Structures are given as structure tokens and as C-alpha cells.
Design a binder for this molecule. Structure first.
Ligand SMILES: O=c1[nH]cc(F)c(=O)[nH]1
Ligand SMILES: O=c1[nH]cc(F)c(=O)[nH]1
Ligand SMILES: OC[C@@H]1OC=C[C@H]1O
Ligand SMILES: OC[C@@H]1OC=C[C@H]1O
Lengths: 293, 293
């Protein structure tokens, strides 16, 4: 049995119209149930071209094969694609950007009367002590002091939410990655930051008041605390799915090993392949949930 | 002359600007950018293409085979365009997405060995106690507690930078807007938040456990403290410019009055025009800077 998508905002029931501004969609101009009522898997990732490539890739693998219109053709803020029960949505970079996406998304699913939905971010990250190209299935999104919490300011007051992910979904994702046997995949905690450069110990930014050994000491401590990769979205993603009772996972590839460098200098061919990795893993997970009861 | 507070950069054999998809070794920065004097940055890549071409035909470069190539065709992270001494760059939404852009932009300026440069953000925001369509030229970026501070965590420890903007620049842009005499323009403070929904006291996100009354109190306290608009980029932008000693301004139109509502429900025709307002202010400022010497 699949439960209905819920909000934690009593105000939406009471509006004549709900405008999903950054999607360019609205209750008064679109029929959400007709459009989305059969969505069961939502995949989200930074790049709109990667999310279109993902919807193409997913379409072949479930034999929906044969074009894919951008459902947000009225904005350039986010891109959205659909085939069968899979919805792909781009979210840009950083907590604030995904957070805007998530609120309108969840409202979208809620208006569509969707049920039994799974949300999975597929992204990129900096690995810590992993060969580049390793995919990490995140157990706990964790903050830059290693605590699994997400701080928000709400009317000027600090509010904190827990950022763990569904354990069983991680185990199930690992099991899929094992079935493919194409690339290494570990389960690990994931540190989420607000800055790619000073925020992640890089020596490579426009500002930096610290040294290689300072960076090393910080990355090794992260490693000991269980963290295996570093990125910029996992936290709010986990906090908001938890807040609304949605089953969610984060699956990210590792573009380089941060113990060895800051700069992403792999050839473009190799970076592209690395990217196809979480799409393959998640494509396997969708294929199995569908070949099932 | 532009400069970085990062001594590691001078030592690097190459500098790869990964999210621009630009590199010192595949791209000639001085040839591409040395003549740049004004850098305009905004969230949306269509807005910024629109801006570079409005500016082109307002400084007379409005030739017939008018195409302005996206110099970042290479990634889909940001768009970038150039005409003459003017560079127009998109930055996505949220403090982290613009911080990535700034780190790489600043570096780029510096590798191009640019001089006398001005950075302006042209953006959108919610106004407090202003008619919709009002342009705010920001005096101090301020956080959700109304303090002029930008907080960053670096190697696990927390640091703050002041977020004042250049006082002589904000007055100069006030004079420009007055020369156009087309839309209201006020100088005030801008609150910068990490979330568009709960972060700006909205009541229409997927999550909300406060009331309309709490929103009004919070927003009126912001207004009492000098804040005139609310948005998501001003503070890192100020902090980063201040750090690097760059002369920088923020100019945003307000898309609605938050004392009246949360949803952006103006007609497409009206919002498009609101969004050209900061583009016309900044085009004056350029036009007349270029008429000096
Ligand atoms: O947030 C990040 N994303 C991708 C990376 F490769 C990295 O180092 N950090
Ligand atoms: O950050 C914001 N940008 C644009 C808006 F209209 C708003 O309310 N907030
Ligand atoms: O490379 C930029 C970032 O990659 C990881 C999360 C994205 O925002
Ligand atoms: O509407 C979204 C936000 O607009 C204002 C700042 C952008 O990041």
C-alpha cells in the first residue's frame, strides 16, 4: 500500500490558486492529477542536461523507447521531464536552490494526489579516500562539524531538523549497484556545505587563508567521522523529505579524491562517464521496483 | 587592478574554472576578458542574455548578425556573454550558487589582469512596504537577524565578513535612476536568506508552522530596521567583493510587496517589464561611465 503525499502547511488547502513560480506551473492553468498522478519515482540532480539525459536513459531501459518535452518550458529556473512513472527534475547548485525546488515539487506531488513516491538525488561530489568515480550512497547527510543536522532560520530563529536517510533504501540501493557490478559503491556519510571552495577545504578559490596541511587535517577528521564524500545539497534534501515523511536517498558519484586535490582535471570523457554512474544505479533500482509485485 | 586573497593561485601551472568550463590552458583570458570594465551578474541566463543585448544596442554595437555567443557553451551551470567592456554572467539561485560563480569570476578577472572593474548584481526580490516594481539599490546586505554580516564555515570553524556596499556607488546609481525618471527607486537594506519560503516568512511553501501574524511582525521588524527588500544573494556577493577590494553594487526590482502576500501573481507581461528596470538603471550607469574617460 502506497501512502498519499502530505504537506506540513495547512495554508495550501485554503488558496484559490497555487502558483509554482519557479516551475512556471499553476493549479489554475495545469491539471496536476492528469499530469503527475501516476509519478512514483522522482529523480533530482543539478544539471538540466544531465536530467534530460537521465530521462532518455530511463526510457530505453523500461522499454518506453521509440522526444521529451521540458515540462518547465515557461522558465529557465529548473528543468522537468516525465516518462511513465518517472519524473526527472533539475535543481541547480546549493541548498537554497534545491530547497526552492523541493517546496514546489512536494506541493506539485501533493496537488497531483501522488502516492508511494520515492525521491532520489543523483549528483556529484568530492570523495574522501576513494578512487575517483566511486559512487557513495549516503546514510547520513551531515553538516561541516559532522553532525547529522540541518539548521534553518525561520523568522530569525534557529530551527534544527534531523538529516538521516531511510536505512532500508540505502541497503536496497547498494544491492542494485552490486547487481550491475560496473563501478565501486560504498555507503558512507556525506558532508553538505554552503561553499564549494573555502567551504570544502579547497586551496583553489579566490580566497583562502589556510594551508595544505590544514586542509588535510580537516579532511582526515571528516574521514574518521565516517564521511566519504562532500557536496552541497544532501542536507536540506534529507531534512525536507524527513519533515514530510517521503522515502528518500542520495546517490552521488565522486569526481576526484579530495585527499589528492581540489581541481577537477579528469578529461571530459571520463567526467561524463562518471556522471552516467548514479543514473545507471538508479535506473537499476527503478527497473527492479517495476519488475516486482 | 583586480586581485585575490589567495596566494596559491599564482603558483598553479593551470587553473581550471570547472563550473564555467573554462581553463587557463584552453582559454586565453587576457585576450577574452582584459578589456572588461563592468561585470553584471543575475540569476537567470535568459535575463542575462537579454541584458547583454539591450546594452549592446544602447552603447551602439547593435549590428545586424547580432548574435551574442554564450562563452560558457561548455556547461549548463552558468551562462556568460560579452560585448565591449561589458560582461554579463548568470549565477543561479542562492548564496552557494553565486559564491561558486564569484570564486571563478574573480579568479577569471584576475587572470585576464582586468582593471577599474565594477560588479553589479541585477536581480529580483520581494519588497517590504513598497509598491511592486520598485527598484531597491542596496546599502547594506543584512542577514535574517538584520546584521551586516555574512557567516561562512571554513574547516569546521565559523567566520564572518562585513557586508557593506560602497557608499559612493549606491548614490551614483540613485542619481542614474533619477535621470531616467521611469520607476521608483529607493536605497535601503536587503535581507539575504537561504530559503525563499520559510526563510522569507512565506506561508505558501510545503512547510510552514507559523501564522500570518508572525510573518507581519517579522517583516515589520525588518522594515523598522531599514530593510526594504528580501532576497538570496546579496550578502555573499558583498562579502566577497569587500574581501577582494572590488567595487560592487546590488540593484533588484521587487516583484511583490510582502506585506501583502507571498505568491508571485502578476501577469507575465508585467513581471517581464519589472525585470528590465534594473537592466535600464545599470545601462544608464554604464552609458554615462563610458562618456567620461
Ligand atoms: O560539492 C562538490 N561537488 C562536486 C565535486 F566534485 C566536489 O568536490 N564538491
Ligand atoms: O528572493 C526573492 N526573490 C524574488 C522574490 F520575489 C522574493 O520574494 N524573494
Ligand atoms: O560542482 C558543483 C556541485 O556538485 C555537487 C553539488 C553541486 O552543486
Ligand atoms: O525567485 C528566486 C530568487 O529571486 C531572487 C533571488 C533569486 O535567487
Amino acid at each position: 500500500h502506497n501512502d498519499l503525499v502530505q504537506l506540513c502547511n495547512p495554508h495550501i488547502a485554503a488558496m484559490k490558486e497555487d502558483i509554482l513560480y519557479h516551475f512556471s506551473l499553476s493549479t489554475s492553468t495545469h491539471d496536476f492529477p492528469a499530469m503527475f498522478g501516476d509519478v512514483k519515482f522522482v529523480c533530482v540532480g543539478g544539471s538540466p542536461s544531465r536530467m534530460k539525459a537521465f530521462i532518455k536513459y530511463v526510457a530505453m531501459e523500461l522499454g518506453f523507447a521509440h522526444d521529451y518535452p521540458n515540462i518547465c518550458e515557461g522558465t529557465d529556473r529548473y528543468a522537468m521531464f516525465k516518462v511513465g512513472p518517472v519524473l526527472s527534475v533539475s535543481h541547480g547548485m546549493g541548498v537554497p536552490s534545491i530547497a526552492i525546488m523541493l517546496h514546489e515539487l512536494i506541493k506539485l506531488l501533493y496537488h497531483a494526489h501522488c502516492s508511494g513516491v520515492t525521491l532520489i538525488r543523483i549528483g556529484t561530489s568530492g570523495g574522501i579516500g576513494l578512487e575517483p568515480g566511486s559512487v557513495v550512497i549516503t546514510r547520513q547527510a551531515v553538516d561541516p562539524c559532522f553532525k547529522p543536522e540541518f539548521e534553518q532560520i525561520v523568522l530569525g530563529k534557529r530551527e534544527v531538523r534531523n538529516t538521516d536517510l531511510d536505512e532500508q533504501l540505502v541497503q536496497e540501493l547498494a544491492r542494485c549497484s552490486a547487481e550491475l557490478g560496473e563501478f565501486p559503491t560504498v555507503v558512507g556519510n556525506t558532508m553538505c556545505t554552503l561553499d564549494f571552495y573555502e567551504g570544502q577545504g579547497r586551496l583553489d578559490g579566490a580566497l583562502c587563508s589556510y594551508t595544505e596541511k590544514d586542509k588535510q587535517d580537516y579532511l582526515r577528521a571528516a574521514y574518521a567521522a565516517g564521511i566519504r564524500n562532500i557536496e552541497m545539497e544532501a542536507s536540506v534534501f534529507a531534512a525536507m523529505c524527513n519533515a514530510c515523511g517521503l522515502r528518500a536517498a542520495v546517490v552521488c558519484v565522486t569526481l576526484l579524491n579530495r585527499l589528492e586535490g581540489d581541481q577537477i582535471s579528469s578529461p571530459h570523457d571520463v567526467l561524463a562517464e562518471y556522471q552516467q554512474r548514479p543514473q545507471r544505479l538508479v535506473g537499476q533500482f527503478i527497473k527492479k521496483r517495476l519488475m516486482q509485485a
